[PDB]
Amino acid sequence: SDLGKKLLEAAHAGQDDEVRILMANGADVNAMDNFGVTPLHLAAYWGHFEIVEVLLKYGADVNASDATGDTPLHLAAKWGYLGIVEVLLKYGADVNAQDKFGKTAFDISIDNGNEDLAEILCKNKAQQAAFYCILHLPNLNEEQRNAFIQSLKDDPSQSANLLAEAKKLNDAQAPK
């Protein structure tokens, strides 16, 4: 009933500067329509990268689901928008989230033949799985955590190697 509406519209239309001044005037960056479609949904779906970036920078809920079960990661995946997918992944887009058909952004990417997209999605899921492991390995104080998380960013090739250490560490740091 004011700015949110205008924002959803400008996001849909790809009018960058219009989106950015609406923001600077206080628009709810997560304004929804009657389908719970957010500005981030429309920009992802319609290919407006800079707008996606602007909305994320302003605290857009990167993992928002509309009433239909779609996330912006799902929407971007159908069109093979590499840049858009990359930047959603940077802001914490959820590679595990499933749409109405039980599909992930990876499944969609596989469905539409988009190999470039599937790859990015694939190695993101794998590196996150690695990160998540470290963070829930009980026998690790907040120091030894950072030690491993960092060394996973600096050598994602020796990752599976590194997880194996973090576990044998965890098993030597246990009441065995």
Partner: protein
């Protein structure tokens, strides 16, 4: 010792009068064709007193009602004549196991596309988001059609498992009403996805879609033969084709069958039978009517084979043969009203597709 015929004013009633002249020339019997407005209301009113036309032409959906009131004589074509018409058309005019009219013409929605914008029209509903993406980039849309009337949104809702009533035992099955099942839900959810992703607008009605297509703004529309004329004037280079599939299954549009019934109170029943079977339902008879005002696709196999050389008519019959005969039943009105509200609620986001469908049935 004469024949009075009633038919609506948008039909080729002058061509029909020519068939009547031939009939008189052969038999001496004068044939009078009239086209009273609201004749679909006039006929049951005056037939109730034993008056009216010997023969009435109208859409089949109305005849179930007339038969109920004992206004329509049973027709007696032998199986040889019945074989001259497409079998599914005899179902539009069967009531309580008695044939109560002669099928004349067949009416259904088809996909209409702008050959300039879109030379190879999609075979599936699924391709259409993609196409809209492409077309929107240059200031066009893929598809605009009446989203307000179920008649238009039903062929998709029906495609994966929807149905009004199933045709068990030649009559209708009134018990299972197919607006709350998984196949309909899938139909309506795909529609709703078109809407929420901005490929279509929920407020699009008949006038908006027609203007949009006829001005070159959208690559496709969904309409029936009655709309061809305005497009002809508009000079858009269009063609008319099979309705797109959804989850592999045909879009099932409702079929309307223009039918000719014989007044129950008529003393000229054999004359009327003679006129309909051996004068009108012939290549030359339908031709006379069709030259005056196009019938679209016809029930008669011989003449439909000729008309179908027009691709648009061919598409109209292919879509008809793939659809469901409009139920000639009274509780169709309850159905329509339910379906109508379920679609608006869902398309508006008022209700989830789930709640919307199970609600319009209570």
């Amino acid at each position: 010792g004469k024949l009075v015929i009633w038919i609506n004013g948008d039909k080729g009633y002058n061509g029909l009068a020519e068939v009547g002249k031939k009939f008189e020339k052969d038999t001496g019997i004068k044939v009078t064709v009239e086209h009273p407005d609201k004749l679909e209301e006039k006929f049951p009113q005056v037939a109730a007193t034993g008056d009216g036309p010997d023969i009435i032409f109208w859409a089949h959906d109305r005849f179930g009602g007339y038969a109920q009131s004992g206004l329509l004589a049973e027709i007696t074509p032998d199986k040889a004549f019945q074989d001259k018409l497409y079998p599914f058309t005899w179902d539009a005019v069967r009531y309580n196991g008695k044939l109560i009219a002669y099928p004349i013409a067949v009416e259904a929605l088809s996909l209409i596309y702008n050959k300039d914008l879109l030379p190879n029209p999609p075979k599936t509903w699924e391709e259409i988001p993609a196409l809209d993406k492409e077309l929107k980039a240059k200031g066009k849309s893929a598809l605009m059609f009446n989203l307000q009337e179920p008649y238009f949104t039903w062929p998709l809702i029906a495609a994966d498992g929807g149905y009004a009533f199933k045709y068990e035992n030649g009559k209708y099955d009134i018990k299972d009403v197919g607006v709350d099942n998984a196949g309909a839900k899938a139909g309506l959810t795909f529609l709703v996805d078109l809407i929420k992703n901005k490929h279509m607008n929920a407020d699009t009605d008949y006038s908006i879609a027609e203007a949009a297509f006829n001005k070159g703004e959208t690559a496709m529309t969904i309409n029936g033969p009655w709309a061809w004329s305005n497009i002809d004037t508009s000079k858009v280079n269009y063609g008319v084709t099979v309705l797109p599939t959804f989850k592999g299954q045909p879009s099932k549009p409702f079929v309307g069958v223009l039918s000719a019934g014989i007044n129950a109170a008529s003393p000229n029943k054999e004359l009327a039978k003679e006129f309909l079977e051996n004068y009108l339902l012939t290549d030359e008879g339908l031709e006379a009517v069709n030259k005056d005002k196009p019938l679209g696709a016809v029930a008669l196999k011989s003449y439909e084979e000729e008309l179908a050389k027009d691709p648009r008519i061919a598409a109209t019959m292919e879509n008809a043969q793939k659809g469901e005969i409009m139920p000639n039943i009274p509780q169709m009105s309850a159905f329509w009203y339910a379906v109508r509200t379920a679609v608006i609620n869902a398309a508006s986001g008022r209700q989830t597709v789930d709640e919307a469908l199970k609600d319009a049935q209570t």
